[PDB]
Design a protein around this ligand. Structure first.
Ligand SMILES: *[C@H](CC(=O)OCC)C(=O)NNC(=O)CCc1ccccc1C(=O)N[C@H](C)c1cccc(-c2ccsc2)c1
Ligand SMILES: [Cl-]
Ligand SMILES: [Zn+2]
Length: 313
C-alpha cells in the first residue's frame, strides 16, 4: 500500500514522525487533524503532504504534558479553537503603522487591533511559551499565530465582537504581574478610614475613572452607611496602569498618557480605535493613521506608564 510520512505535533516544536495510509482520512488515523489551521480531518492524505507538520489533539498523557508546557492550559478544545482562528488570521494583513504592528480590518477585528497596539506599548511578560514566541514574531509583523492565540485564550471566535478591556484581563492572567502591588485608602466621614492593598492583575486595572491623576487626588465612591466616600491611590508599584470607564467624551493631552482606546457604539455593538501619544497625537484605525495635535472623543480605556508612586497625603 502506498504510504507517506508526516509530522504530528501539539506545539510545533516537538514533532512526532508518523506514517499515513493514503486510503484513510486523517480523522481515522489521528482524529481531528489540522494543517496550518485548515481542518483536514475528513481528507485523505495527498502526495504533497509529505514531510509537512500537522496539528493533532492531545490524546495520550505525553501530549497532554507537551500541550500544557507550551500553552499552560488543560482545555481539550483549545487547539481546535486555536487552529480555527489561525485559519482566518493567517489571511489577515499586519501592516506597520507608526512603528507598531496593527491589523488591516477583517471580520470585525477592531478590538483585536486595538489590543495588539496596546500590548506593544506596555511592559508585559507572558508566562506560556506559546504567547512568548508568538508575541516575539508579532512585533516583527508575523502576528497571525499570536492573534489566533488571543481568540483561543479568550474563548472568542473570528467575527465575534469583543471588548478590549476584557481581552486585557484574559491576557493579564497569563502574564507575570505578580510583582505588581497597589495600595488604596477609602475614607468616610461616618464609618471611618480603611486601607486596602491589591496585588497582581487587580493592582494594574481599575474601573471607574480614566484619569490617573484624579485617582491619586481621590474619586467619589458609594458606601454601606450611605455616604460618598473618597478613594485615593496611596502607593502603586507597576510598570503600567490601566484606567477604564464607560465610554464618554474625554480629552487626551500629549505626554500625560501612553495610549487610549476609543469606543464608538452601543453596549456590545461598536467600533474600536487606538490612540497613542508619540511625536503628536496619533489615531490608528487598523491600517488607517491620523495625526492630530489635540484629541477629544469617546474614550473607555487609558494606559499610563509607571515605576513606583507613593502619594503625599
Ligand atoms: C470590532 C467591530 C468592528 O470591526 O466595527 C467595524 C466598523 C469589535 O469587535 N468591536 N467591539 C464591540 O462591539 C464591543 C462588544 C462588547 C463585548 C463584551 C463586553 C462588552 C462589549 C462593549 O460593548 N464594550 C464597550 C467599551 C462599552 C460600552 C458601553 C458600556 C460599557 C460598560 C462596561 C462596564 S460598565 C459599562 C462598555
Ligand atoms: Cl513575552
Ligand atoms: Zn461610610
Amino acid at each position: 500500500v502506498r504510504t507517506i510520512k508526516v509530522f504530528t505535533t501539539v506545539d510545533n516544536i516537538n514533532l512526532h514522525t508518523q506514517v499515513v495510509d493514503m486510503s484513510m482520512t486523517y480523522g481515522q488515523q489521528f482524529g481531528p487533524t489540522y494543517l496550518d489551521g485548515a481542518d483536514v480531518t475528513k481528507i485523505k492524505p495527498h502526495n504533497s503532504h509529505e514531510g509537512k507538520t500537522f496539528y493533532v489533539l492531545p490524546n495520550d498523557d505525553t501530549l497532554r504534558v507537551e500541550a500544557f508546557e507550551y500553552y499552560h492550559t488543560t482545555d481539550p478544545s483549545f487547539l481546535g479553537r486555536y487552529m480555527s482562528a489561525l485559519n482566518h488570521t493567517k489571511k489577515w494583513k499586519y501592516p506597520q503603522v507608526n512603528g507598531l504592528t496593527s491589523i488591516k480590518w477583517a471580520d470585525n477585528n477592531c478590538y483585536l487591533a486595538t489590543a495588539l497596539l496596546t500590548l506593544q506599548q506596555i511592559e508585559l511578560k507572558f508566562n506560556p511559551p506559546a504567547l512568548q514566541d508568538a508575541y516575539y514574531r508579532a512585533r516583527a509583523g508575523e502576528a497571525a499565530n499570536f492573534c489566533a492565540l488571543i481568540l483561543a485564550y479568550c474563548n472568542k471566535t473570528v467575527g465575534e465582537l469583543g471588548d478590549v478591556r476584557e481581552t486585557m484581563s484574559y491576557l493579564f492572567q497569563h502574564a507575570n504581574l505578580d510583582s505588581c502591588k497597589r495600595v488604596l485608602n477609602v475614607v468616610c466621614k461616618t464609618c471611618g478610614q480603611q486601607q486596602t492593598t491589591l496585588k497582581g492583575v487587580e493592582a494594574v486595572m481599575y474601573m471607574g475613572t480614566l484619569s490617573y491623576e484624579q485617582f491619586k487626588k481621590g474619586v467619589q465612591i458609594p458606601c454601606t452607611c450611605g455616604k460618598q466616600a473618597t478613594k485615593y491611590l496611596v502607593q502603586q508599584e507597576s510598570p503600567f496602569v490601566m484606567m477604564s470607564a464607560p465610554p464618554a467624551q474625554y480629552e487626551l493631552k500629549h505626554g500625560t498618557f501612553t495610549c487610549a482606546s476609543e469606543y464608538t457604539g452601543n453596549y456590545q455593538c461598536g467600533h474600536y480605535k487606538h490612540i497613542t501619544s508619540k511625536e503628536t497625537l496619533y489615531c490608528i484605525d487598523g491600517a488607517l493613521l491620523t495625526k492630530s495635535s489635540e484629541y477629544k472623543g469617546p474614550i473607555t480605556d487609558v494606559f499610563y506608564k509607571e515605576n513606583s508612586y507613593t502619594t503625599t497625603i
